[PDB]
Design an enzyme around this catalytic site. Structure first.
Site, mmCIF file in Angstrom:
data_model
loop_
_atom_site.group_PDB
_atom_site.id
_atom_site.type_symbol
_atom_site.label_atom_id
_atom_site.label_comp_id
_atom_site.label_asym_id
_atom_site.label_seq_id
_atom_site.Cartn_x
_atom_site.Cartn_y
_atom_site.Cartn_z
ATOM 1 N N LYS A 1 14.220 -3.000 -122.260
ATOM 2 C CA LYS A 1 12.757 -3.436 -122.523
ATOM 3 C C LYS A 1 12.357 -3.764 -121.185
ATOM 4 O O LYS A 1 12.870 -4.252 -120.327
ATOM 5 C CB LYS A 1 12.687 -4.480 -123.392
ATOM 6 C CG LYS A 1 11.643 -5.145 -123.772
ATOM 7 C CD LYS A 1 11.470 -6.610 -124.302
ATOM 8 C CE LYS A 1 10.120 -7.326 -124.027
ATOM 9 N NZ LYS A 1 8.975 -6.592 -124.904
ATOM 10 N N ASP B 1 12.479 -6.523 -101.498
ATOM 11 C CA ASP B 1 12.928 -7.314 -102.619
ATOM 12 C C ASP B 1 14.420 -7.088 -102.996
ATOM 13 O O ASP B 1 14.619 -6.741 -104.198
ATOM 14 C CB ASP B 1 12.074 -7.435 -103.887
ATOM 15 C CG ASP B 1 12.595 -8.556 -105.051
ATOM 16 O OD1 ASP B 1 13.236 -9.427 -104.763
ATOM 17 O OD2 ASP B 1 12.034 -8.230 -106.078
#
Ligand SMILES: COc1cc2c(Nc3ccc(NC(=O)c4ccccc4)cc3)ncnc2cc1OCCCN1CCOCC1
EC number: 2.7.11.1
Lengths: 269, 43
Positions: A15, A130
């Site tokens: 998801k 990141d």
């Protein structure tokens, strides 16, 4: 051009905020991939349209065995679909969590693969910003795949100012409000190597302010089980001064990486 | 969950794909893309 009907949908893999990712098969070629679905209305509502198109621009122009490929993309009335390389072994962070920490072979291989992909990005003036386990997937033979470019930037001239990434991974220069450059990724690589081998990031603390403090002091405390070689690499990456950090080529060439990496390049067409 | 997408059928297919890579640069990379500015527009 592609449409959703061009794909057999197998099952959901994950998801997301703006839609799910699915295991899918392109029908004509019986070729298995991942399909990321994003809802146009939710993207507009959240105000992330230009964010998304930046991510897509960056990732769709990168071709490297250790960067998750975006083959193409399409849209219909309600959805944006991203055709992505399927990574059979899934989330690197789940594997790290499962094992607690990685052994030196696993860690060194990952570091070589990471340094190679990041070198490829930096060659193109793309800074990732990141790098952390949650942003990495694993290929058929466990090859690292940089999967997410959510904080990434094409930075041809100007040094950057945006504080971004993840608390435990922030370099001193971001915390201190300085401009930064591509050498932020060198710092994050050092944090990543440490987390691979220890199972916790090096500046772990219960408060934002104590974490900030440990980072800017480079308050590095090596657990006793770490080899001299791994500590050497980490120490050479976790430098306060960005220009003193070991270059990506230097990571690839580091003796500990050479001695322990069992990196295999995937077959190419 | 269709048969191809689980168990031995999936594993088999995944392995075949790894060792016999197709020309994705021609197969998909050459296929037209919607312009990024038109992504939030009509389809
Ligand atoms: C379930 O997690 C997966 C996620 C995958 C995955 N997830 C992505 C989702 C989105 C995504 N890109 C974006 O969301 C995105 C957003 C904006 C702009 C560009 C890309 C990249 C990768 N891609 C490819 N392959 C994947 C494969 C995944 O798992 C494979 C199952 C592995 N394994 C099976 C049994 O053991 C435990 C799990």
């Amino acid at each position: 051009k592609f449409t959703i009907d061009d794909f057999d949908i197998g099952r959901p893999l994950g998801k997301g905020k703006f839609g799910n990712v699915y295991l899918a098969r392109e029908k004509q070629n019986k070729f298995i991939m991942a399909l990321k679905v994003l809802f146009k209305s939710q993207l507009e509502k959240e105000g992330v349209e230009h964010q998304l198109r930046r991510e897509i621009e960056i990732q769709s122009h990168l071709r490297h065995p250790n960067i998750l490929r975006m083959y193409n993309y399409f849209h219909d009335r309600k959805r944006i679909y991203l055709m992505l390389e399927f990574a059979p072994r899934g989330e690197l962070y789940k594997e790290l969590q499962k094992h607690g920490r990685f052994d030196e072979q696993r860690s060194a291989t990952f570091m070589e693969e990471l340094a190679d992909a990041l070198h490829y990005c930096h060659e193109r003036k793309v800074i990732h910003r990141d790098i952390k386990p949650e942003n990495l997937l694993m290929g058929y033979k466990g090859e690292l795949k940089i999967a997410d470019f959510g904080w990434s930037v094409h930075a041809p001239s100007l040094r950057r100012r945006t504080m971004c990434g993840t608390l435990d991974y922030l370099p001193p220069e971001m915390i201190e409000g300085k401009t930064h450059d591509e050498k932020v990724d060198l710092w994050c690589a050092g944090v990543l190597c440490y987390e691979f081998l220890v199972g916790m990031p090096p500046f772990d603390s219960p408060s934002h302010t104590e974490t900030h403090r440990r980072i800017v002091n480079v308050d590095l405390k090596f657990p006793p089980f770490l080899s001299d070689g791994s500590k050497d690499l980490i120490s050479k990456l976790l430098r306060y001064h960005p220009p003193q950090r070991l270059p990506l080529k230097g990571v690839m060439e580091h003796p500990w990486v050479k001695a322990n990496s069992r990196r295999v390049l995937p077959p190419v067409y | 969950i269709p048969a191809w997408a689980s168990g031995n059928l999936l594993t088999q297919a995944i392995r075949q794909q790894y060792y016999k890579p197709i020309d994705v640069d021609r197969m998909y990379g050459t296929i037209d893309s919607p312009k990024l500015e038109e992504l939030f527009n009509k389809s």
